Write a protein that binds this DNA or RNA. Structure first.
Ligand code: FES
Lengths: 178, 71, 26, 174, 281, 183, 234
RNA sequence: GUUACUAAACAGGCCAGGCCGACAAGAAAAAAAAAAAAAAAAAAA
RNA sequence: UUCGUUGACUGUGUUUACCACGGGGAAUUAGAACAGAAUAUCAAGAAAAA
RNA sequence: AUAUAACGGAAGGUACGCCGGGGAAGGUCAGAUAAUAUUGGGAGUUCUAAUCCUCGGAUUGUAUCACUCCGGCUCAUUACUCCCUUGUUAUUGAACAAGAU
């Protein structure tokens, strides 16, 4: 129940079919900032590790980043010294079979600047890593801030009340109406 | 679904609600023996299964197959 | 392993007839 | 250095198991007809498998179990299937009847149904059965010609040849 | 000492016929499945250690002790157990003859023995303890008074006095103590059984409610708070309605993604029967 | 480490010598298979017609009287059991769990590295303890010899009844030292 | 509180989901405690509530609001219970509502909100403050649904190994009339709604036994056969 | 009435081809007990 | 029970599930009949006044 | 009892060869790889873009590696601001000169 640093799933050293990447059951929602795949693809362990290192370097030691998927699915390739048709090749790499709509990385820190709605999110690390992923990506930020708590609505209502009051005083002072 | 409890009440002793199969079973006598024909909800729907069971009961009554064989 | 029948249609309802394509009874 | 499996070409397995039912519902059968083919060999992690072969069916009314666990008929009748909710298995029964026309109004007797116990399975078989041996019934369009010829003579005989003479049917009540 | 880091003993090697090496003979079905027959292991192939003083001499000593105590005591204990398990309600007195008019039977053991045509010689054969488990059980509960004293007498040196002179009122005391001291809950085993299962007590429907006095009204009132009637019904009778959402997650959301919607096995096993206590009418 | 139960020969020297001595083995076997009269030939009789007729008459009388006597106890026990089960059924569901646990109940053991106290049967409640002196004073000569032999064989079977209580640690040894011993 | 009145039009007798979708609407079915009633809701209006965060996907408030759909002369007071929406795009495909009736338990996952993070001592000291539980399960029997739960962190100081705001702290936010409560299965004293801890200091834990590797799932929603091998490390 | 057969590739791997005249065929009969304790005998008939 | 036993029989009858054929042989029926021999198991035991 | 376990039941060479029949440098593919920029990183006193090295993804492309009857000479044809020659005055870590992209 306390916070923990769960160990990563291990690499399965079992030959498996190339197969197809099944679709996502539904939207994946996580508070904070998320980088979400937009098309299906299989991301290599090297690519995931590079993205993690870049995210850590950009954000800093004081901030924590969660890698949502892991490369456990084996993928094989033949040695150049083997002829055609002599069975499947040796394991060559490991991949995560990311569908469309799957979060790759996310940071759970909520945006503190609720009263500054015009300051839109900082996606610096996501921008740094996106052009290197083999998947198109979309940047998301969800902070559980609902419009019922919006401060801009109160600001607008106050401005409207002030305007109405000003027009009322101007009319009264000029005295063209009862 | 939402259904009134009076649906499962049968108006005749030979018409029974079987809840395992959710079917209306109608009893009758044929060839000096006792038989039961089921009318499933999965087949007819909620109201129509009961309606068809009642119609089959009337058919068996006309055929005289509701009478107890005697030896 | 089972092949599952396709239920919704793409176009028109299928219709089967005897014999090869030709002008036939109408 | 690739180890070619023994079951590679040309020495693969010629004949497949073909495990499963061999007669559908409402079909007419006589003693000795194999209703379901099954095998004794069992997989080593059966509870994790998903193919339908590994999960056998169960005998019911007028059905025996063979040496290799095939389900075979024991009386002249029509096939029926049942689902055992308690054990979550399929049960094969044969309702005894003499050969006669299979009418549309009688097809409900061979529906697959859910039961909780084999006692209820027997009760349902009695309730759907057409008639009892000691009382019989009026046969509706029963066959009157001799049976199909032996397979080794002709595989494609004709059923109820009008040119053949009527012969008594005195075997389908046993 | 008494407290120790005990090692789990290695399983005993069940033998097997040297055949059928390509098949799985260890399906989890119940004897005697019509379509999943179980392969037998001949008793001549079960690996057993050579007989020495640890397994043979001990049996000889226990057999000598039983001989001294008399096979009649063992016969009487077995008869009393069998009659007690079947006479847990008031019976009418039963005579062994149609016209005796004076002789009484001594238990429903009579009815069972007559119905099964049980072997008078067989009872003596059982009491003579020809089997390893029988001798092991006598070494553990061999005392005549076991229904009341359990294994406490397993090492007592004047134990034969019970067998020699525990009769009549003392036998009645043993039985009455045993009836109160015996277990009456659910037995939980995966091993095969073929005898009439021992009784499990039925459980009453209602629970007990705690009540404390309140002088503001001079009356006793329930300790538990009020809550909404719907909440009370949910807490008492269960989830209510035929369908509800699953239990909410009680652990912090995992940082990694896992396919938690996937069922454990492609084809789930059949439902398990309720072995617990039944309700009271 | 983790230990396994064991009983070394040194701590049980007495029973090993008892069972390895030929004469003591012969005496024990004779006691087990007493009497030792032959039973193969047709002419082997350990009794006589009149003797076994009188024995049968006495046995039949004894069994008849015992069945006539103990039947009242059996009926009373049946009624008592009925009452006990009725009371258990009448108990509330909260107390049901405790009311079916038997005297010897104890929570499950944990191999770490309504239950107030352990179950202990008062030794003063054992039948032979309560009436030991009277029965002993009323025994016969053969019964006294039987009691002596029963004692001696009990001691032979359990030379270490007190030693196990005193030093239970002597009967538990590590796996790596126990499993490596031949039978 | 967060109840929303909405206007709908009929899902007519031969139209399909795809037709209503291409007509610029979302197909919805209201069920439970009455007849199954079909309707269509203007997609812009519905998606405004469903995706009320400019950079966010489906909002936890969607399945926790009380909708007041109006069809013809009827008013359906219900809650969204099933939502088919696009994994990537902010598109609503299909909706299934279940009616809410005063007196019967409705199982609603009411969301949590931390608007006062700038007043948190732990956050100002540079430590990581996390909202662990986006929603809290509640059993509601009243005529209204509780609004989102405000988690106040102005007194959340950091002490090793971590500090937590648990459900007992929020217990005071429930209605005074007792029309709503936290799920009884919750242990209020140990169910943590918020954490404050230091990055890089957490203890190690093994992967949960209920973990299912998403790389070995077939298109049918079943585990691949390789997951049952003796050598499968996960 | 009624949804069940079905492993092609030098595809991803398995194989022990054997036992029993009987506690291994087998009539009748019998058959494996929660927790804890005792015993340290791999033990249901 | 520490219980018997040898049907792990001798023959007559061309009918039967499956199907390229062969090996009715992954291993089907009481072909419910007939001529011999053998092994195990029976059933019944109802009626206890005032 | 018997061998058929190849389980419907074990000598080699021919570049001296012969007869009958049939034919693999392309066409195609795009793994490495080539071009272009781009992302991350490392060099360049300081400096991510004067300039250099390397990594991932993207588009385009086929120099090298993984369907017939080598090299040189002679004569050549076409593409690429391309090796020298041009853009006074692009940029330069461009004083000039010699240079670099
Ligand atoms: S045997 Fe224990 S008191 Fe009698």
């Amino acid at each position: 129940m306390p916070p923990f640093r769960f160990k990563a799933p291990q690499e399965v050293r079992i030959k498996v079919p190339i197969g197809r990447i099944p679709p996502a059951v539904g939207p994946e929602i996580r508070l904070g900032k998320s980088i979400v795949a937009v098309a299906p693809h299989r991301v290599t362990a090297e690519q995931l590790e590079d993205a993690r290192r870049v995210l850590r370097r950009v954000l800093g030691r004081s901030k924590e980043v969660h890698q949502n998927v892991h490369a456990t699915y084996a993928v094989t390739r033949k040695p150049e010294g083997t002829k055609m048709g002599q069975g499947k090749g040796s394991i060559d790499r490991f991949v995560a079979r990311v569908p469309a709509g799957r979060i790759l990385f996310h940071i759970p820190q909520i945006n503190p600047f609720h009263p500054f709605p015009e300051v839109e999110p900082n996606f610096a690390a996501f921008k740094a890593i996106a052009p290197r992923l083999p998947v198109p990506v979309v940047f998301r930020e969800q902070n559980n801030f609902f419009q019922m708590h919006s401060v801009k609505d109160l600001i607008r209502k106050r401005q409207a009340e002030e305007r109405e009051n000003r027009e009322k005083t101007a009319r009264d002072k000029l005295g063209g109406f009862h | 679904v939402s259904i009134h409890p009076s649906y499962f009440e049968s108006p005749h002793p030979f018409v029974i609600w079987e809840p395992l199969n959710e079917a209306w079973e109608v009893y009758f006598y044929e060839n000096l023996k006792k038989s039961a024909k089921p009318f499933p909800v999965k087949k007819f729907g909620i109201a129509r299964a009961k309606r068809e069971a009642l119609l089959f009961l009337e058919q068996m009554k006309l055929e005289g197959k509701l009478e107890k064989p005697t030896f | 392993l089972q092949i599952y029948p396709q239920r919704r249609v793409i176009g028109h309802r299928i219709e089967i007839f005897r014999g090869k394509h030709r002008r036939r009874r109408m | 250095s690739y180890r070619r499996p023994s079951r590679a070409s040309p020495t693969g397995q010629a004949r497949k198991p073909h495990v499963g039912v061999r007669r559908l519902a409402a079909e007419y059968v006589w003693p000795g007809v194999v209703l379901v083919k099954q095998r004794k060999v069992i997989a080593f992690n059966v509870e994790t498998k998903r193919r339908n072969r590994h999960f056998k069916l169960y005998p019911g009314e007028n059905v025996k179990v063979s040496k290799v666990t095939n389900l075979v008929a024991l009386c002249h009748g029509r096939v029926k299937f049942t689902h055992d909710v308690s054990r979550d298995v399929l049960v094969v029964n044969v309702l005894p009847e003499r050969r006669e026309e299979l009418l549309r109004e009688d097809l409900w007797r061979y529906r697959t149904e859910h039961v909780r116990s084999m006692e209820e399975n027997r009760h349902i078989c009695f309730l759907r059965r057409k008639a009892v041996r000691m009382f019989g019934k009026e046969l509706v369009n029963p066959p009157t010609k001799p049976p199909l010829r032996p397979f080794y003579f002709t595989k494609y005989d004709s059923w109820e040849n009008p040119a053949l003479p009527d012969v008594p049917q005195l075997d389908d009540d046993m | 000492p008494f407290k120790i880091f005990k090692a789990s003993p290695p399983p005993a090697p069940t033998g097997r016929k040297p055949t059928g090496y390509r098949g799985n003979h260890w399906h989890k079905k119940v004897l005697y499945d019509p379509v999943y027959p179980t392969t037998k292991v001949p008793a001549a192939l079960v690996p057993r250690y050579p007989i020495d003083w640890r397994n043979g001499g001990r049996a000889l000593l226990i057999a000598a002790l039983s001989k001294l105590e008399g096979a009649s005591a063992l016969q009487r204990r077995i008869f009393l157990r069998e009659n007690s398990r079947e006479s847990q309600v008031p019976q009418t007195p039963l005579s062994p003859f149609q016209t005796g008019s004076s002789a009484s039977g001594g238990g429903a053991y009579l009815v069972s023995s007559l119905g099964r045509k049980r072997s008078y010689v067989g009872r003596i054969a059982v009491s003579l303890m020809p089997r390893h488990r029988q001798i092991a059980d006598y070494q553990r509960v061999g005392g005549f008074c076991s229904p009341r004293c359990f294994s406490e007498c397993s090492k007592e040196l004047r134990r034969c006095l019970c067998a020699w002179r525990c009769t009549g009122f003392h036998e009645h005391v043993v039985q009455m103590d045993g009836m109160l001291g015996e277990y009456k809950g659910e037995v939980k085993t995966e091993k095969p059984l073929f005898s009439v299962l021992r009784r499990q007590a039925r459980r009453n429907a209602d629970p007990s409610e705690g009540v404390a006095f309140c002088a503001e009204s001079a009356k006793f009132k329930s300790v538990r708070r009020a809550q909404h009637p719907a909440f009370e019904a949910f807490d008492r009778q269960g989830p209510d309605g035929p369908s509800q959402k699953p239990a909410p997650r009680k652990e912090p959301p995992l940082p990694f993604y896992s396919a938690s919607h996937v069922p454990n096995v492609p084809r789930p096993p059949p439902p398990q029967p309720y072995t617990g206590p039944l309700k009271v009418r | 480490t983790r230990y396994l139960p064991f009983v070394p020969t040194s701590l049980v020297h007495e029973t090993t010598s008892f069972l390895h001595d030929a004469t003591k083995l012969r005496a024990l076997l004779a006691l087990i298979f007493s009497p030792c009269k032959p039973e193969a030939s047709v002419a082997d009789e350990l009794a006589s017609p009149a003797a076994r007729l009188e024995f049968q008459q006495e046995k039949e009388r004894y069994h008849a009287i015992r069945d006539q006597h103990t039947d009242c106890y059996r009926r009373h026990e049946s009624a008592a059991a009925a009452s006990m089960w009725r009371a258990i059924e009448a108990l509330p569901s909260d107390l049901y769990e405790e009311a079916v646990q038997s005297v010897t109940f104890a929570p499950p053991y944990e191999n770490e590295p309504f239950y107030h106290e352990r179950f202990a049967f008062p030794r003063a409640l054992m039948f032979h303890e309560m009436y030991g002196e009277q029965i002993f004073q009323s025994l016969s000569q053969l019964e006294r010899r039987k009691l002596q032999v029963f004692m001696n064989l009990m001691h032979v079977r359990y030379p270490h009844a007190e030693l196990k209580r005193d030093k239970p640690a002597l009967f538990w040894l590590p796996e790596r030292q126990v499993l490596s011993r031949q039978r | 509180s967060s109840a929303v009145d909405v206007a709908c039009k009929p899902w007519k007798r031969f139209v399909r989901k795809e037709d209503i979708q291409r007509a610029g609407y979302v197909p919805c079915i209201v069920e439970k405690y009455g007849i199954e009633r079909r309707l269509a809701i203007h997609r812009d209006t519905l998606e405004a509530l469903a995706f009320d965060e400019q950079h966010g996907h489906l909002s936890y408030l969607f399945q926790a609001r009380l909708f007041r759909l109006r069809i013809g002369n009827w008013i359906e007071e219900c809650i969204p219970t099933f939502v088919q929406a696009d994994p990537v795009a902010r598109r609503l495909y299909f909706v299934k509502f279940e009616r809410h009736v005063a007196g019967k338990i409705s199982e609603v996952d009411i969301p949590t909100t931390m608007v006062g993070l700038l007043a948190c001592p732990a956050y100002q000291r540079g430590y990581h403050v996390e909202l662990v539980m986006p929603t809290i399960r509640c059993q509601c029997v009243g005529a209204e649904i509780p609004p989102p739960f405000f988690v106040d962190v102005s007194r959340l100081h950091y002490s090793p190994p971590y500090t937590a705001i648990t459900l007992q702290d929020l217990q005071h936010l429930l209605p005074a009339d007792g029309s709503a409560r936290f799920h009884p299965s919750y242990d209020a004293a140990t169910q943590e709604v918020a954490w404050a801890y230091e990055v890089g200091s957490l203890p190690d834990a093994p992967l949960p036994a209920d973990y299912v590797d998403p790389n070995f799932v077939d298109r049918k929603g079943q585990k691949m056969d390789v997951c049952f091998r003796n050598h499968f490390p996960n």
